[PDB]
Write a protein that binds this DNA or RNA. Structure first.
Ligand SMILES: [K+]
Ligand SMILES: [K+]
Ligand SMILES: [K+]
Ligand SMILES: [K+]
Ligand SMILES: [K+]
Ligand SMILES: [K+]
Ligand SMILES: [K+]
Ligand SMILES: [K+]
Ligand SMILES: [K+]
Ligand SMILES: [K+]
Ligand SMILES: [K+]
Ligand SMILES: [K+]
Ligand SMILES: [K+]
Ligand SMILES: [K+]
Ligand SMILES: [K+]
Ligand SMILES: [K+]
Ligand SMILES: [K+]
Ligand SMILES: [K+]
Ligand SMILES: [K+]
Ligand SMILES: [K+]
Ligand SMILES: [K+]
Ligand SMILES: [K+]
Ligand SMILES: [K+]
Ligand SMILES: [K+]
Ligand SMILES: [K+]
Ligand SMILES: [Mg+2]
Ligand SMILES: [Mg+2]
Ligand SMILES: [Mg+2]
Ligand SMILES: [Mg+2]
Ligand SMILES: [Mg+2]
Ligand SMILES: [Mg+2]
Ligand SMILES: [Mg+2]
Ligand SMILES: [Mg+2]
Ligand SMILES: [Mg+2]
Ligand SMILES: [Mg+2]
Ligand SMILES: [Mg+2]
Ligand SMILES: [Mg+2]
Ligand SMILES: [Mg+2]
Ligand SMILES: [Mg+2]
Ligand SMILES: [Mg+2]
Ligand SMILES: [Mg+2]
Ligand SMILES: [Mg+2]
Ligand SMILES: [Mg+2]
Ligand SMILES: [Mg+2]
Ligand SMILES: [Mg+2]
Ligand SMILES: [Mg+2]
Ligand SMILES: [Mg+2]
Ligand SMILES: [Mg+2]
Ligand SMILES: [Mg+2]
Ligand SMILES: [Mg+2]
Ligand SMILES: [Mg+2]
Ligand SMILES: [Mg+2]
Ligand SMILES: [Mg+2]
Ligand SMILES: [Mg+2]
Ligand SMILES: [Mg+2]
Ligand SMILES: [Mg+2]
Ligand SMILES: [Mg+2]
Ligand SMILES: [Mg+2]
Ligand SMILES: [Mg+2]
Ligand SMILES: [Mg+2]
Ligand SMILES: [Mg+2]
Ligand SMILES: [Mg+2]
Ligand SMILES: [Mg+2]
Ligand SMILES: [Mg+2]
Ligand SMILES: [Mg+2]
Ligand SMILES: [Mg+2]
Ligand SMILES: [Mg+2]
Ligand SMILES: [Mg+2]
Ligand SMILES: [Mg+2]
Ligand SMILES: [Mg+2]
Ligand SMILES: [Mg+2]
Ligand SMILES: [Mg+2]
Ligand SMILES: [Mg+2]
Ligand SMILES: [Mg+2]
Ligand SMILES: [Mg+2]
Ligand SMILES: [Mg+2]
Ligand SMILES: [Mg+2]
Ligand SMILES: [Mg+2]
Ligand SMILES: [Mg+2]
Ligand SMILES: [Mg+2]
Ligand SMILES: [Mg+2]
Ligand SMILES: [Mg+2]
Ligand SMILES: [Mg+2]
Ligand SMILES: [Mg+2]
Ligand SMILES: [Mg+2]
Ligand SMILES: [Mg+2]
Ligand SMILES: [Mg+2]
Ligand SMILES: [Mg+2]
Ligand SMILES: [Mg+2]
Ligand SMILES: [Mg+2]
Ligand SMILES: [Mg+2]
Ligand SMILES: [Mg+2]
Ligand SMILES: [Mg+2]
Ligand SMILES: [Mg+2]
Ligand SMILES: [Mg+2]
Ligand SMILES: [Mg+2]
Ligand SMILES: [Mg+2]
Ligand SMILES: [Mg+2]
Ligand SMILES: [Mg+2]
Ligand SMILES: [Mg+2]
Ligand SMILES: [Mg+2]
Ligand SMILES: [Mg+2]
Ligand SMILES: [Mg+2]
Ligand SMILES: [Mg+2]
Ligand SMILES: [Mg+2]
Ligand SMILES: [Mg+2]
Ligand SMILES: [Mg+2]
Ligand SMILES: [Mg+2]
Ligand SMILES: [Mg+2]
Ligand SMILES: [Mg+2]
Ligand SMILES: [Mg+2]
Ligand SMILES: [Mg+2]
Lengths: 75, 48, 64
RNA sequence: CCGCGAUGGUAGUGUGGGGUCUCCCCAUGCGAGAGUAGG
RNA sequence: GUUUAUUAAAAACACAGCACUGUGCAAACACGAAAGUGGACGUAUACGGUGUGACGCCUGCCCGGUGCCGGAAGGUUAAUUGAUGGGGUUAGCGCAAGCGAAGCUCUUGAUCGAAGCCCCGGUAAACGGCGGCCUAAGGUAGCGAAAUUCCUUGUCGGGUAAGUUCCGACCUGCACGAAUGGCGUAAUGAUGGCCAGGCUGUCUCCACCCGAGACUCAGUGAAAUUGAACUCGCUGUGAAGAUGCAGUGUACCCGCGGCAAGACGGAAAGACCCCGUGAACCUUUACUAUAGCUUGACACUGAACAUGUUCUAACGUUGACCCGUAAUCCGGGUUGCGGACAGUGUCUGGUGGGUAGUUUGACUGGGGCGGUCUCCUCCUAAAGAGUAACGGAGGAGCACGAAGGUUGGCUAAUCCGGAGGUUAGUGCAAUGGCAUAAGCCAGCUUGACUGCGAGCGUGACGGCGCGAGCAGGUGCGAAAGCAGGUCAUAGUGAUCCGGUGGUUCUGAAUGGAAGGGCCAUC
RNA sequence: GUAACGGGGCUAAACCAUGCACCGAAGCUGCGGCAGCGACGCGUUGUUGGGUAGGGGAGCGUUCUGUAAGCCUG
RNA sequence: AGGACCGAACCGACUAAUGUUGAAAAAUUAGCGGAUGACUUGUGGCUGGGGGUGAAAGGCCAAUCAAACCGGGAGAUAGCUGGUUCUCCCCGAAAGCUAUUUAGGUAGCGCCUCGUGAAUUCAUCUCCGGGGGUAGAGCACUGUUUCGGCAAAACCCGAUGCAAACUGCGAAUACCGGAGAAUGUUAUCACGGGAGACACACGGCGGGUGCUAACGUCCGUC
RNA sequence: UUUUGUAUAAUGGGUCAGCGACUUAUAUUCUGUAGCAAGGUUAACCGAAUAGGGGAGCCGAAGGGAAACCGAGUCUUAACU
RNA sequence: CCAUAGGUUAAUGAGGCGAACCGGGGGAACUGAAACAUCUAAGUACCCCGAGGAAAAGAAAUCAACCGAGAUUCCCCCAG
């Protein structure tokens, strides 16, 4: 009665902290907002976080909930 | 083009376009060809 | 004797200036209502044959 | 900005080596979690 | 009686007898593109086909299924015929847009139309079937642990000291049964089973003897096999059962007669088993064809009214007679009979394992049977990605003009206004998300926009995904802004072929058109 | 068939600890030689050279044609 | 009289032994059946290969039969098996992924080789920037569990464990990025010529499966 | 030889001698080499001619677009940052 | 009935064989499509008839494209 599975979705972090990225570059693929969009980062319809400017990726923990945000520090 | 039985590239892609009969009877002349004719008048017959 | 062109391949590929091949994208013949306009728009322009496939196409089109 | 915590020990573990090899031990490096003093 | 020449002689085949069924004679039927020939120089007391198998007593119920036979009202239905509509072209009419006669032409398909099928009956010595409320009907007579009985060496009786076999019974017939006959049956059988008398070297248990080989001498003189051999035992080892490796034991060199435990001995590229998108032949309500059979239309094919028959002149004659002619062929003639029928050609519907070509998947702890095959979620998965098993668990093949967009407003479960704080909710699995709520309500709406797209993710590829921003045009909001569907991740199908709409494309002399392309879509 | 140290044998020739010696390979070093590659002195220095499928490079020999009415050969 | 009886010739072929590189590619010996018949035999004739003939065994059709023999299409096709011949030098795999009427075949990619081009391109270490949810741990959550207390035995509280599909915690390693040195025959990437390979095996470590059985099976990694 | 792996008790060979398996034609691409070079080269055929003639053709010097067409641009789109 | 069929004789010709090529009448399958039926193999193999030194074809109811060509046959291109 078992024997089924789905294709692996290649989620996860594509660009880690301090990496130089071009605008448009995908930083994380995820299901929901496990990471949140900080400065110069957009959030796509499938919760993909992507760079809206050229610069370096920065992960940070901010807010009252203590949420993982991703920003781009512009070069 | 055989790929082991997988639908091959030249069949999984669509056909497109048609062939123009007019293109076969149309040529391009370079500027370097203009001096090669006899007598300094360039028309179809002198090019031929 | 002369090599014969694979005539089905000649109807689907055209050789470009630097010797690549352009083709029409798959998936824009039918079942179009369910497809997003964005997806269909991106399938309209012709694309280049990929590196992995060039060997197969060249074999089929010796007089390209 | 976003309401805990040493020290010590213990667990685990990278590399190399070993045993009585379902599991461990030794050399070296990394070293929690929980808890304790305390804040 | 017959049979597998060469492993089967039988219970198999045949058989007289029985029954069903076809067949009116140019018989049915068979061989033959045909002419003809067999059937038969026969004629229904005959001939073909089928089943059963002397004889005796018999042969029950079911016509729903499949076949066959009969029916012929109605439905459906071929070729054929071409009504009607729609289009192309262009004489003209128009200042132009366009409109548009005739002709030619592309398309549409009214009407006509037989058999078949549906339909209504019949038929079981047609193929078949013969119950635990249900069926077409529920197995009669006879027989029964059987050439059938799995359980089973059933149980009881007989025979034997002892009998899984045998004989007689019982009936609980796994799974008998009435012409793919039931039950009996004298005689018959190189037939199967069982018992007894006689008989014996079959045996207890072998002994001796006579001959032919074997053995020795002379003469002649093969064979299979064979990588090379200086070719021992044992215990281990080891492509896992060793003459050949290790260790060890034993062993002077070489014949001859004997025996077969080993050389995984010789012989034959395993027949079993699996595999190959191998073969053959066989089957059928597998697919596609097709001979044959059958239907109608037109032709050969005509004449009088009926919307009936009659006629003779085509055509047939395997009736008679005459001639070629010394001829049961053939032809011609005369005549009778039949007669536009029959029959044949082309076309056409039906039927068609009679015949032909083929197909009939893969995975798989062998194959088969079962299960599975694409997509989504979790775990296995070793804290980036990815990661297998016929591993462990669940889902999808949609829904929604609001359940989408935006602005404003709102916050749950559960327990007893309060407590509590998401323990609820999400359109639907699971996981990760969601209060700034993505949960929930109302108003106004159509951004579920069109063209594009820096850059990036993910794929062998085909592809799939995320995306600021730019142009045009839009909604909401006061505006900032937000909106290119939905909390996200399933809800899917390449190409070909063709359909529909559009179109600054193409248009085989030229103008058009057809067809093609391109865009949208099925 | 001893047959559960490879055997003999062993009371250490067993086991534990500590130490110093030695044996031991186609490993390393020494001496001689050949070749590949990297810079060019056309100098010598560094380094490399186990190989199936397979890729690359360079050769040997055989018959025949020219060179050859030449050359070798009773 | 008789598909009557006993039994030679004649026609058969039930049993046994022998023979099985035979005396013989089917016989010999001892027995056996029919023997006036649906008998047997001589000579000649006729039937022809999807065809004949068959008292039916797929029997027989010249030692050949579920489609004769001979010649031809013909070198059918063979994703299968076998075999593939002189020498030296350099490099040197794979037994994986994806797809496949695919699974012992094949294709793209990965890995080999040759050529060309190009960056401090690549690797090791150190330092720096990162995300982790594994090991371990823990029990707030989702389940499971025992004892005591409390009490509608629920709930709640204290105490004790357990978890691949539990996480209010959380390593080592590994991985991504940056910087720096030393070392390394560019070790890197791209493009192009030529491949082979897509049966893997055992051992270590982490696991699923199996019995923490297998020289078992299926992954990861060396 | 085949294999994960063979002294294997898996395959093949009794031995010797002789023969016995990547060829040939045409097309196409890449490498080397030679000629000529924005050009290169001819086919059939003619020619007693390995000459010479024969440039019909073919490839190249321009691409883009389905195409008309435009052209160092072109396509896309009403139009491109 | 005329006749015609038929009969006899005479003259002339045919007949049979042969390797290929040639025209015509018939006409496979293996195979390829990685199965297979359309399709392929192929109007091939093969059978049959007829001819000639050659055969066949041949003097436009042909092409072309508004310019023109000028029977048939064969070769090289066009062009995979
Ligand atoms: K990225
Ligand atoms: K008998
Ligand atoms: K009936
Ligand atoms: K008209
Ligand atoms: K029975
Ligand atoms: K019957
Ligand atoms: K009877
Ligand atoms: K030994
Ligand atoms: K023996
Ligand atoms: K008559
Ligand atoms: K008629
Ligand atoms: K398995
Ligand atoms: K097994
Ligand atoms: K806009
Ligand atoms: K045959
Ligand atoms: K491959
Ligand atoms: K390469
Ligand atoms: K392993
Ligand atoms: K094997
Ligand atoms: K064997
Ligand atoms: K070549
Ligand atoms: K060249
Ligand atoms: K451009
Ligand atoms: K065929
Ligand atoms: K095939
Ligand atoms: Mg998986
Ligand atoms: Mg998943
Ligand atoms: Mg379309
Ligand atoms: Mg500590
Ligand atoms: Mg701590
Ligand atoms: Mg008898
Ligand atoms: Mg026999
Ligand atoms: Mg017999
Ligand atoms: Mg008759
Ligand atoms: Mg019978
Ligand atoms: Mg009717
Ligand atoms: Mg009745
Ligand atoms: Mg009864
Ligand atoms: Mg029994
Ligand atoms: Mg009994
Ligand atoms: Mg009894
Ligand atoms: Mg007895
Ligand atoms: Mg007995
Ligand atoms: Mg009895
Ligand atoms: Mg019966
Ligand atoms: Mg019965
Ligand atoms: Mg009856
Ligand atoms: Mg009956
Ligand atoms: Mg009977
Ligand atoms: Mg009876
Ligand atoms: Mg002698
Ligand atoms: Mg042994
Ligand atoms: Mg002896
Ligand atoms: Mg013996
Ligand atoms: Mg043997
Ligand atoms: Mg075999
Ligand atoms: Mg008729
Ligand atoms: Mg049939
Ligand atoms: Mg058949
Ligand atoms: Mg076939
Ligand atoms: Mg078949
Ligand atoms: Mg299978
Ligand atoms: Mg992971
Ligand atoms: Mg990991
Ligand atoms: Mg892997
Ligand atoms: Mg794998
Ligand atoms: Mg799996
Ligand atoms: Mg781009
Ligand atoms: Mg079609
Ligand atoms: Mg026209
Ligand atoms: Mg025309
Ligand atoms: Mg159109
Ligand atoms: Mg003993
Ligand atoms: Mg040494
Ligand atoms: Mg050395
Ligand atoms: Mg040296
Ligand atoms: Mg070495
Ligand atoms: Mg070497
Ligand atoms: Mg010479
Ligand atoms: Mg008698
Ligand atoms: Mg006989
Ligand atoms: Mg006898
Ligand atoms: Mg008798
Ligand atoms: Mg007798
Ligand atoms: Mg049989
Ligand atoms: Mg015979
Ligand atoms: Mg056959
Ligand atoms: Mg052939
Ligand atoms: Mg052959
Ligand atoms: Mg090497
Ligand atoms: Mg896939
Ligand atoms: Mg744990
Ligand atoms: Mg866990
Ligand atoms: Mg680094
Ligand atoms: Mg494979
Ligand atoms: Mg494999
Ligand atoms: Mg495997
Ligand atoms: Mg493996
Ligand atoms: Mg393990
Ligand atoms: Mg194993
Ligand atoms: Mg194991
Ligand atoms: Mg094996
Ligand atoms: Mg060995
Ligand atoms: Mg041996
Ligand atoms: Mg051997
Ligand atoms: Mg073999
Ligand atoms: Mg042998
Ligand atoms: Mg161009
Ligand atoms: Mg085929
Ligand atoms: Mg002549
Ligand atoms: Mg002539
Ligand atoms: Mg004119």
């Amino acid at each position: 009665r078992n024997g089924r599975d789905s294709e692996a979705k290649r989620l996860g972090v594509k660009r880690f902290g301090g990496e130089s990225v071009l605008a448009g570059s995908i930083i994380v693929r995820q299901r929901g907002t496990k990471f949140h969009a900080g400065a110069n980062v957009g959030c796509g319809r499938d919760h993909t976080l992507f760079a809206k400017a050229d610069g370096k990726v920065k992960f940070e923990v901010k807010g009252p909930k203590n949420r993982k945000f991703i920003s781009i520090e512009a070069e | 083009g055989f790929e082991g039985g997988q639908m091959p590239l030249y069949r999984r892609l669509p056909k497109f376009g048609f062939t123009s009969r007019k293109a076969a009877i149309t040529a391009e002349i370079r500027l370097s060809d203009l001096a090669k004719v006899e007598g300094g008048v360039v028309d179809l017959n002198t090019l031929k | 004797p002369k090599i014969k062109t694979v005539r089905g391949a000649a109807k689907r590929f055209k050789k470009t200036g630097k010797g690549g091949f352009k083709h029409k994208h798959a998936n824009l013949r039918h079942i179009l209502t369910k497809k997003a306009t964005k997806r269909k728009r991106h399938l309209r322009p012709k694309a280049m044959v990929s590196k992995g496939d060039l060997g197969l196409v060249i074999a089929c089109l010796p007089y390209a």
